Design a protein around this ligand. Sequence first.
Ligand SMILES: OC[C@H]1O[C@@H](O[C@H]2[C@H](O)[C@@H](O)[C@H](O)O[C@@H]2CO)[C@H](O)[C@@H](O)[C@@H]1O
Length: 180
Amino acid sequence: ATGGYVQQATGQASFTMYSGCGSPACGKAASGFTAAINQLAFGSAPGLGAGDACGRCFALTGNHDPYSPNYTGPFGQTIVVKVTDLCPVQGNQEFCGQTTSNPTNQHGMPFHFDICEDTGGSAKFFPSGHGALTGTFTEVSCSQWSGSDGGQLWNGACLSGETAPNWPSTACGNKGTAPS
Ligand SMILES: OC[C@H]1O[C@@H](O[C@H]2[C@H](O)[C@@H](O)[C@H](O)O[C@@H]2CO)[C@H](O)[C@@H](O)[C@@H]1O
């Protein structure tokens, strides 16, 4: 996409969970299940505001524990998250280090979703004792997402991806150039 970001409506991803998504990089939180997506897919860098991932909805499915490869299941449920946040390259090399010259993370995944624990998404997705998974994602209509957006936290906050057709398309728009 514009800026060299890798923004595809379906693919393979790794998955983690994080705490504190009340002030996310898109500039609006949301009451439903939400996630951060890795910088290369988010469409912006730290401090540059919302990228074109902002507010898009994705169905996530975990099917492998890379830390416990002998574990055959059960995994969690497929959940639908709204992207509100950025998992930046800086400080997240294992999972969010995808760059245009090296587009997979240390688990070979081209995308990563960091699922917010606060609003319940990770409890539906991660079996107890299994904090990181790999699997698949598919962008879906936000008709499939339960919840309401929070208010703007600053000028330029954007979740307009929630009404956009699936990638390839433009809503909030990408900022700057993808990390190389
Ligand atoms: O770095 C992305 C993401 O990781 C989260 O911690 C992971 C950790 O990286 C992984 O090694 C462990 O097995 O599972 C935890 C939880 O999923 C961390 O909570 C996030 O803040 C961070 O953005």
